Amino acid sequence: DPFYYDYETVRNGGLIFAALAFIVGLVIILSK
Amino acid sequence: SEKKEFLGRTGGSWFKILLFYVIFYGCLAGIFIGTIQVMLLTISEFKPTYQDRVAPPGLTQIPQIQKTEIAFRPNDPKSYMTYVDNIDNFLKKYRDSAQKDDMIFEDCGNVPSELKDRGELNNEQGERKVCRFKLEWLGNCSGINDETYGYKDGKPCVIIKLNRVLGFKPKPPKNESLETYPVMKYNPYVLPVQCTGKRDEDKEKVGSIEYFGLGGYPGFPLQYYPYYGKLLQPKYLQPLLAVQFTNLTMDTEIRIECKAYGENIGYSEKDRFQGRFDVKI
Amino acid sequence: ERDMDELKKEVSMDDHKLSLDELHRKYGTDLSRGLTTARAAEILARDGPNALTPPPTTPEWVKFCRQLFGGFSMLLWIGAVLCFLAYGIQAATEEEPQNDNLYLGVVLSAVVIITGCFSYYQEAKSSKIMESFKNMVPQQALVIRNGEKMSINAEEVVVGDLVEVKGGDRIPADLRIISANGCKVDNSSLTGESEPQTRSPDFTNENPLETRNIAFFSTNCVEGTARGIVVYTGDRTVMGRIATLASGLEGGQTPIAAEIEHFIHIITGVAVFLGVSFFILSLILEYTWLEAVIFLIGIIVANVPEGLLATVTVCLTLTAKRMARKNCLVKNLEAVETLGSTSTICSDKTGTLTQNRMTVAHMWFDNQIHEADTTENQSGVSFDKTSATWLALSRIAGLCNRAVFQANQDNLPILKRAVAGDASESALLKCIEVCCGSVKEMRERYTKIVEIPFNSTNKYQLSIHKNANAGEPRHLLVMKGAPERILDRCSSILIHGKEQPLDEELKDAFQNAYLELGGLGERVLGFCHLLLPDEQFPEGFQFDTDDVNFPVDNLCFVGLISMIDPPRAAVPDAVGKCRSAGIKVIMVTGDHPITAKAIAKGVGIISEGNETVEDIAARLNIPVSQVNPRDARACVVHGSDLKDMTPEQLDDILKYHTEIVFARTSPQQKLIIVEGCQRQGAIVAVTGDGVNDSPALKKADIGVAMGIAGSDVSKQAADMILLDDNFASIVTGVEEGRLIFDNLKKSIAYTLTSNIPEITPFLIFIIANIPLPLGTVTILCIDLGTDMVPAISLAYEQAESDIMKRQPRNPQTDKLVNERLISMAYGQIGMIQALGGFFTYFVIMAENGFLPNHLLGIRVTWDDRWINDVEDSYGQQWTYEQRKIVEFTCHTAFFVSIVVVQWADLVICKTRRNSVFQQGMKNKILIFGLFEETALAAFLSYCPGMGVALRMYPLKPTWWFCAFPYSLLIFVYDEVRKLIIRRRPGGWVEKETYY
Ligand SMILES: C[C@@H]1O[C@@H](O[C@H]2C[C@@H](O)[C@]3(CO)[C@H]4[C@H](O)C[C@]5(C)[C@@H](C6=CC(=O)OC6)CC[C@]5(O)[C@@H]4CC[C@]3(O)C2)[C@H](O)[C@H](O)[C@H]1O
Numbered sequence A: 001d002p003f004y005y006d007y008e009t010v011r012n013g014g015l016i017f018a019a020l021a022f023i024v025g026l027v028i029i030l031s032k
Numbered sequence B: 001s002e003k004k005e006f007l008g009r010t011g012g013s014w015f016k017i018l019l020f021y022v023i024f025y026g027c028l029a030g031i032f033i034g035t036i037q038v039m040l041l042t043i044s045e046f047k048p049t050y051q052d053r054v055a056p057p058g059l060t061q062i063p064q065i066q067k068t069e070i071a072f073r074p075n076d077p078k079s080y081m082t083y084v085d086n087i088d089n090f091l092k093k094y095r096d097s098a099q100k101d102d103m104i105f106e107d108c109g110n111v112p113s114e115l116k117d118r119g120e121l122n123n124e125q126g127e128r129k130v131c132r133f134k135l136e137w138l139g140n141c142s143g144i145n146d147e148t149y150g151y152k153d154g155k156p157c158v159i160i161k162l163n164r165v166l167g168f169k170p171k172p173p174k175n176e177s178l179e180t181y182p183v184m185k186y187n188p189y190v191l192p193v194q195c196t197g198k199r200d201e202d203k204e205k206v207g208s209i210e211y212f213g214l215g216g217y218p219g220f221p222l223q224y225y226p227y228y229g230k231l232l233q234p235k236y237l238q239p240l241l242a243v244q245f246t247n248l249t250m251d252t253e254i255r256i257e258c259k260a261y262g263e264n265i266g267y268s269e270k271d272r273f274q275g276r277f278d279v280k281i
Numbered sequence C: 001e002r003d004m005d006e007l008k009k010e011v012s013m014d015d016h017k018l019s020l021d022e023l024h025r026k027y028g029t030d031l032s033r034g035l036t037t038a039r040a041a042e043i044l045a046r047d048g049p050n051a052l053t054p055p056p057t058t059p060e061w062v063k064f065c066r067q068l069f070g071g072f073s074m075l076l077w078i079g080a081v082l083c084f085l086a087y088g089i090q091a092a093t094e095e096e097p098q099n100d101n102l103y104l105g106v107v108l109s110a111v112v113i114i115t116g117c118f119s120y121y122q123e124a125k126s127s128k129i130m131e132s133f134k135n136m137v138p139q140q141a142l143v144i145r146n147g148e149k150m151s152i153n154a155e156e157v158v159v160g161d162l163v164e165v166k167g168g169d170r171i172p173a174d175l176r177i178i179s180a181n182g183c184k185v186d187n188s189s190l191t192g193e194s195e196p197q198t199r200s201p202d203f204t205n206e207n208p209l210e211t212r213n214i215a216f217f218s219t220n221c222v223e224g225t226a227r228g229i230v231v232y233t234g235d236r237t238v239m240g241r242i243a244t245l246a247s248g249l250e251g252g253q254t255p256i257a258a259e260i261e262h263f264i265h266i267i268t269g270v271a272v273f274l275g276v277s278f279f280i281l282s283l284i285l286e287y288t289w290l291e292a293v294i295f296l297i298g299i300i301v302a303n304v305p306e307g308l309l310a311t312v313t314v315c316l317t318l319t320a321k322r323m324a325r326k327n328c329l330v331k332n333l334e335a336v337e338t339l340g341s342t343s344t345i346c347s348d349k350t351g352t353l354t355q356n357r358m359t360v361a362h363m364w365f366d367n368q369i370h371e372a373d374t375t376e377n378q379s380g381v382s383f384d385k386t387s388a389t390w391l392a393l394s395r396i397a398g399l400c401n402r403a404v405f406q407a408n409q410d411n412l413p414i415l416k417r418a419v420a421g422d423a424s425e426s427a428l429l430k431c432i433e434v435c436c437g438s439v440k441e442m443r444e445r446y447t448k449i450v451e452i453p454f455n456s457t458n459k460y461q462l463s464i465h466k467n468a469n470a471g472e473p474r475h476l477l478v479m480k481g482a483p484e485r486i487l488d489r490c491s492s493i494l495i496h497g498k499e500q501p502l503d504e505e506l507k508d509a510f511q512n513a514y515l516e517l518g519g520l521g522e523r524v525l526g527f528c529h530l531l532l533p534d535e536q537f538p539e540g541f542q543f544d545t546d547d548v549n550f551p552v553d554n555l556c557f558v559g560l561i562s563m564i565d566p567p568r569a570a571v572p573d574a575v576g577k578c579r580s581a582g583i584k585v586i587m588v589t590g591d592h593p594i595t596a597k598a599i600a601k602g603v604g605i606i607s608e609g610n611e612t613v614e615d616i617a618a619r620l621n622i623p624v625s626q627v628n629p630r631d632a633r634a635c636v637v638h639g640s641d642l643k644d645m646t647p648e649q650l651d652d653i654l655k656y657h658t659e660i661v662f663a664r665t666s667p668q669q670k671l672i673i674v675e676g677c678q679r680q681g682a683i684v685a686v687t688g689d690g691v692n693d694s695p696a697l698k699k700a701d702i703g704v705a706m707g708i709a710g711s712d713v714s715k716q717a718a719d720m721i722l723l724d725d726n727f728a729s730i731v732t733g734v735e736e737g738r739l740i741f742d743n744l745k746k747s748i749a750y751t752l753t754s755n756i757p758e759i760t761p762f763l764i765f766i767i768a769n770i771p772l773p774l775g776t777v778t779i780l781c782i783d784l785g786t787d788m789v790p791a792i793s794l795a796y797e798q799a800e801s802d803i804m805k806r807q808p809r810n811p812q813t814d815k816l817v818n819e820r821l822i823s824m825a826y827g828q829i830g831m832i833q834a835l836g837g838f839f840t841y842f843v844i845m846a847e848n849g850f851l852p853n854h855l856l857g858i859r860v861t862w863d864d865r866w867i868n869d870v871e872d873s874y875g876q877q878w879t880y881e882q883r884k885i886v887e888f889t890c891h892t893a894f895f896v897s898i899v900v901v902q903w904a905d906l907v908i909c910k911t912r913r914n915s916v917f918q919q920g921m922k923n924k925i926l927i928f929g930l931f932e933e934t935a936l937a938a939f940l941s942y943c944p945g946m947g948v949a950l951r952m953y954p955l956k957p958t959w960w961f962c963a964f965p966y967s968l969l970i971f972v973y974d975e976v977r978k979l980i981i982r983r984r985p986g987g988w989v990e991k992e993t994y995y
């Protein structure tokens, strides 16, 4: 059915990205 | 404000500035219209891109109220004029004289029948025909001339209608159905509806229920589905189901919930009109 | 009290000139026996103890309220009150704002409260670290009562009782000196006089400040001993009046806060313009006065930049953190920037510009002048010590002194180590200790027999010792004293180890040498010795100070020793950098003119090649009144003339002279000079040490005191303090203050760019009657939600060019937030941002079945809760919560899109002029700003239960890329704008846009 959209995969992708970019930015702030 | 030579504040170069903003905002406007135009180029003429939002179709009433409540005097004409006129303008589209054309209209079963599939989503075949719906299918509520005619005047009556969703093919509950309450046996070919005073808890319930369906059948015929859209099927007549309350307590307000049952049907606790129905009377 | 502070701004007067007869006839005292114990105990309880009334400012922690108001927190306050009022009006029916407007007002309130909390915590932290620095050691006065000397607590000293002071002792109260022996008091802090002034019973100068018969409170006595009757006690003393005056002046509004006020007036201006024009417009169509008022409030409040308080306060706090890292501490949070706007610096000389330590500079050997090493670390050049004349001179200077290295100085450097003795004696002692070796065994080598301390008259100091050499057991005599008098008492001259008579050629060579070193600003002391005819004065002859045993004339004059207090190491460079910044440097001092001008030339306040009126008159051999003052670029104003000066004269002096030095100036006159500088309409920074700078440092647009070598009063009256006593920090200050300004603009601009795409959704919502594109929650998740970190990171931007090259900003002309800036943020960039947002909006709705042209006029039925059949363009029927969910999904993507355009806006705001390819992405906090921002937005959208909580729903992938071309457009547009601005600095794009 066209009436089923997968919101959970999209969601997972969003959150995973969030973690990645956040920790990457943390890597950027700390220059050693 | 003004001195030589400036208009408040500095008015010498105003031509340059205002010209700049005309050209500027002009470019911005043109750009926006462009993006919006390509966006509109990506949208289909037949089917919408995302149908997932309306997926649990809702149940609606003919006299849509301020808030879910029919409260009127059985005596005063001016009391129910609102409701009455609403039902009049609602069923004005369903008259036997309203559908003359055998060209754009189709006379379908006097009895609930199997779903009607016409071609595909595309324009390959021409504009699709639409099944006829006689007002006689609802007895004692707005049937032709004789009676009611006060539209619930002696005792309350309201027609329930299913929301329209493109390509939706309603799936009635199985014949194995779990406690669906008194219902008839024609279940394969129709989407059923049943009404009670309060849903899962103790009730104030006082009522007597009379249903008028297609062929005297409490539910929507599948033969009117799927709906092919405003473009392919303009002047499309969706099924209607009349429900009359004969015995009620007059001067006390009670609530009524009507639920439609099926596999294609679902309900939201947050959206009280989604999959189900609520009216105070 | 106005009359009080009118009497405190006037210079003092006294009874100081009297016969001791009339002195104790007036005071009712005995000169020798002081007063009776009962009388002292009577006067002590009559008025008050001897001490200053503790500073009148002791604000209770209720002073918290001060940080909760200001000028901006007021704007947020009325914003909140308008919010709550709007909710009150919205109680007219059943209403949603329970999740909208009440939350908005409460949020505004929370922002003000928290901001005030933070700023107050910073200022209070500064207060604490300032409290820790207070070390007050009780110093008991030595009084004399009923003929007996009793040392009692200083606070128990009364008026008109005999007090004795000794070497090192601090003066208890204001005294009239009845008697003195070799007494040099240190007035450096109070009157600004560098060298210790002799104190005598005799009346010298009419002005009680420069006269010798008065000793002053808080002054330490350098050397000798003295006796005096107390004229003044407690708050009635001189520095007490100075302190009560300094405590009773006003700070004045900081330029930064004023700019904030102007800015607020602008923002509220467009707020009420939009609000009113749109109120009228809304009434023109349909909506009743209720709805109309609601719209008015909605708009005016929407125009309020909620997070800008937080961001600005944080910014100021950050720069303040760096200032603290450099050990430059600012009492006030907004006084950090002021330096950058300063077009004139009035600095005091001794204690500020100088190390305030008397040191040997030049010496005189064989009719030749040789410069010693005057640096603190001894990094300069040493003279030639092989000469025997140097040996003799060094022995003379070392052998006659009262100077003694105190007990605990061993490891310390010979310069910075402490010495008990006079100024001159200290400098001499240190110099001889470093250059010629140890003065311990060398001073005890020769045994002192009978010495004459420096006399009240003629001030000649002589001593005579035995001989430590092998060949000649003659009696050695040594004397030091003023060059002229010792010239009178001398005949023979010593050259290269062999004597001679005096010939007028080399005698006048000596004279002109003395006038050269004296004119150089240094104080010169003549040194002589005479070996004695041991035949006439045998080895057993005991001679006393009663009569003349030794031939006081026909001595052997050796050479001259001159001395001065050097500037601090970082001072000349600092002054140079200040003059390079376009800042006018004016020395203001109460010192003597001869030393003042010299120091001024040393530090670069008066440059090489510039001549004062007196210099021109000196070179051309014409009367001083002849030459044209217009031809004189530099000027030294005697304090004597300043008292007779009118405002026009001071204005002319300050206008027509580039290099200005005010000498012999009283504290009130310093205040008058500062005020005179402010009359020109120019921002003023003042730097000082002692209490004489207390009225100036207070009145100045910004005061700067010295942590260690500065007094307490001027430390209280200062808006800024230097803990390490590094003058160079001032430069850093005017650097820092000049940078933080630019960044601020950027910061502000950024948030103000957000308001256009924030406000317009609710605008056209009313106009085109479309479903609401942008909710309240989203907007809060933008102003306070996301843009915060980038806006803060915009403070870590560096200089786009050399900031110390450009002239100081003009307060009238150059503005923080000005028409150009609004023309940019609201006018251009923000509009593109809005277009991007509405684009995304239409994308989402059109993809879900609702076409844009259909969306017009729908909201009436759309916001209706009870219409559950709502036809899209396709003919489908939508219930309430379904289409509302869609709308809420439109909110989130609108929010994300705002973030997306705020990317480009952030990058382009990073630089006002330079292209981004130049200034570079080198700011890291900015990068993390971006990453954190995006991650936060994505989190908000995709976090579970956020559709229940904030009603933010996950976005389909494609949604994200709808705002991209608009952001790119923003970047390209501002980049080519910042191209053309660079290429054409006429300029139209420069005049209209550049902010
Ligand atoms: C069609 C119209 O809209 C409905 O309410 C409207 C008025 C009012 O209620 C509000 C909520 O109070 C307004 C409020 O005024 C001002 C805001 C807080 C303001 C902001 C300031 C800021 O900083 O950020 C944003 C801009 C819009 C705003 O965000 C909300 C948006 C939701 C809305 O609800 C819309 C009712 O149905 C009304 O009856 C009907 O006339």
Ligand SMILES: CC(C)CCC[C@@H](C)[C@H]1CC[C@H]2[C@@H]3CC=C4C[C@@H](O)CC[C@]4(C)[C@H]3CC[C@]12C
Pocket: A009, A010, A011, A013, A014, A017, C930, C934, C938, C956, C957, C958, C960
């Ligand atoms: C960081 C700067 C330079 C911008 C460049 C990165 C952009 C193009 C990236 C970073 C954030 C990304 C998103 C993270 C969230 C996901 C959810 C997923 O279900 C669809 C794709 C989507 C929506 C991503 C699309 C690409 C995105 C918009």
Ligand SMILES: CC(C)CCC[C@@H](C)[C@H]1CC[C@H]2[C@@H]3CC=C4C[C@@H](O)CC[C@]4(C)[C@H]3CC[C@]12C
Pocket: B034, B035, B036, B038, B039, B042, C843, C958, C961, C962, C965, C968
């Ligand atoms: C010249 C470059 C930089 C861009 C040119 C502008 C046009 C042609 C581009 C820019 C942004 C683009 C859109 C971004 C969003 C998508 C959403 C998707 O559901 C349909 C197509 C659509 C709508 C794109 C079509 C083309 C578009 C409108």
Ligand SMILES: [Mg+2]
Pocket: C250, C251, C252, C697, C698, C699, C700, C701, C702, C703, C717, C718, C719
């Ligand atoms: Mg101040």
Ligand SMILES: [Mg+2]
Pocket: C188, C189, C192, C348, C349, C350, C351, C352, C688, C689, C690
């Ligand atoms: Mg000083």
Ligand SMILES: [Mg+2]
Pocket: C304, C305, C306, C751, C754, C755, C758, C783
């Ligand atoms: Mg805002």
